[PDB]
Every structure is written in structure tokens, then in C-alpha cells.
């Protein structure tokens, strides 16, 4: 029953005119609860989950103020990085940042993180010990030395181990009706004849939460990966997720195949077999 809180930030430079596009989203496990879009009219941090709207004005004023400070830092960074990499000013670039904390099943601090990327590749990241930094290249190296002298890690560690975890627990309690509830996948199987001698069996997993799940096909009690297809887990759009796995089999032998579903909301894994 571990949980986590994470903030994602993306900034895209626009050399033609104006400031970078800035977008920030906040999540608790697989549930988004806040967002900020520089392109939006409010210019304020906004709610994306019912249970977060319980927070008062001081909350939203503080979060708004802070998220704007985040965008300005990203604006400055885009400039600093263009220099480090000796890049033209005519091209658009991207900086991304993600940070957060996890609490174990004991609801105690488990781990924290703070990673950074430039143009889609790792740049610099705080190591699990939350004291050292991992720099991907010499540009990141200069940042590392600067953050080590400024003791940036110590400041982040205090947040990740303290503030971060404290608010995560607060949110978990306020939105317990959903955040602390698991939605077991709703499953069924479909049959589609692809020829006079072959058929496709598709195992469906629907409306489940959290997203983490495992679907596996077995033939006569043995895992089978040959002639199978597994799509990536996808959002239903209503907060839940979907996934399916298919296998091509000889018409008339459908009984040999079983679909196994593992999910946190299932006391024990489910096994499905064609009618």
C-alpha cells in the first residue's frame, strides 16, 4: 500500500516571440490533482481533483506564487543551457523537471527524487541517497559543482523527507474515498475468427486503478509469448485504465489457453478461459 506524490514541469522556448510555454501538473499515485498552463487565462494553479478543492485561498495563492517561480527558473535555464551547449537562438528547446516522494506501506518516508532533462535526455539528477548528484555530461557537470557549493541537495532533502511526505499523507486522507481505494479490473474475453482455421482471443482488463497491472497468456498451463500481442496501458479518461492481451490460436483449441490477470485490487490473480 505504498503511495507517492509527483510534480512534472515542462518548458518549451519560443524564439520567434515571447516567453517559453510552461506546463506543470501534480499527481498523487496515478491521480492528477493540480495543473498550471502559462497559456491559460487564470495564470493560477488550478484544481483537477474534487478532494483538492477543500484547500483554502492561502493554499492556492502559495502554490500559484511558487509555480510561477518555477517557470521563471526554467526560462533562465533554457538560456543558460543554450550557452553551455553553444546552440543557436533560432531553435526551440525543452527543459523538463520531475520531483517527488514515496511513502512505504508503513506510510513512512520511503524515497525522494528530483530529476532534470534537456531536449529529452537526462541532464542532472539527485541520487537516492539525496546527497549526491548524477550528471550526464560536462554541461551537467558545471551545474553539479555549482549546486554542490550552494548545498542544493540539503535543501531538497529537507523538503522531500519532510514537507513532501506530510502533504502526501494529508492528500491521501482528504481524498481517501478514491486515492485509498483500488479498482479491480473488469475482465472478459472476445473471440474473432481470422481464417477458417485460426482465431484470435483477446483478454480485456477494464476500469482498473491504479494503472500497474500484468496480463499473461498460458497454453496448457505454460506461459506463451509467441503469437501474442500486448498493448500499452491506456487511460480510459475517467480516471481508470485499460489494457488487453491477444493470442492467435488454432480454431477448436481455445480451451488450452488461459489469460492471467494480476492487479493490486485482486485478492488473488484471476484466470480466464474461452467458453
Amino acid at each position: 500500500g505504498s503511495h507517492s506524490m509527483r510534480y512534472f514541469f515542462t518548458s518549451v522556448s519560443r524564439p520567434g516571440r515571447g516567453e517559453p510555454r510552461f506546463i506543470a501538473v501534480g499527481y498523487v499515485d496515478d491521480t492528477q490533482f493540480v495543473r498550471f498552463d502559462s497559456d491559460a487565462a487564470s495564470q493560477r494553479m488550478e484544481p483537477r481533483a474534487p478532494w483538492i478543492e477543500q484547500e483554502g485561498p492561502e493554499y492556492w495563492d502559495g502554490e500559484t506564487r511558487k509555480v510561477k517561480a518555477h517557470s521563471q527558473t526554467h526560462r533562465v535555464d533554457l538560456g543558460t543551457l543554450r550557452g553551455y551547449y553553444n546552440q543557436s537562438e533560432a531553435g526551440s528547446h525543452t527543459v523538463q523537471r520531475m520531483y517527488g516522494c514515496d511513502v512505504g506501506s508503513d506510510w513512512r518516508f520511503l524515497r525522494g527524487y528530483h530529476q532534470y532533462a534537456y531536449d529529452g535526455k537526462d541532464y542532472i539528477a539527485l541520487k537516492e541517497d539525496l546527497r549526491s548528484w548524477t550528471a550526464a555530461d560536462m554541461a551537467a557537470q558545471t551545474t553539479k559543482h555549482k549546486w554542490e557549493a550552494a548545498h542544493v541537495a540539503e535543501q531538497l532533502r529537507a523538503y522531500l523527507e519532510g514537507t513532501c511526505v506530510e502533504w502526501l499523507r494529508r492528500y491521501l486522507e482528504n481524498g481517501k474515498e478514491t486515492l485509498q481505494r483500488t479498482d479491480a479490473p473488469k475482465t472478459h474475453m472476445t473471440h474473432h475468427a481470422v481464417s477458417d482455421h485460426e482465431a484470435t482471443l483477446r483478454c480485456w482488463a477494464l476500469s482498473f486503478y491504479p494503472a500497474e497491472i500484468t496480463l499473461t497468456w498460458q497454453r496448457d498451463g505454460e506461459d506463451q509469448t509467441q503469437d501474442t500481442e500486448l498493448v500499452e496501458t491506456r487511460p480510459a479518461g475517467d480516471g481508470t485504465f485499460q489494457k488487453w492481451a491477444a493470442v492467435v490460436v488454432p480454431s477448436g483449441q481455445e480451451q488450452r489457453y488461459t489469460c492471467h490477470v494480476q492487479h493490486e485490487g485482486l485478492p488473488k490473480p484471476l484466470t480466464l478461459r474461452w467458453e
Partner: peptide
């Protein structure tokens, strides 16, 4: 809740 200070690269 977001972190308060965000150092520049």
C-alpha cells in the same frame, strides 16, 4: 504542495 526554492542551472 510544491517546493519553495528552485535553484537555477
Amino acid at each position: 504542495s510544491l517546493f519553495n526554492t528552485i535553484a537555477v542551472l
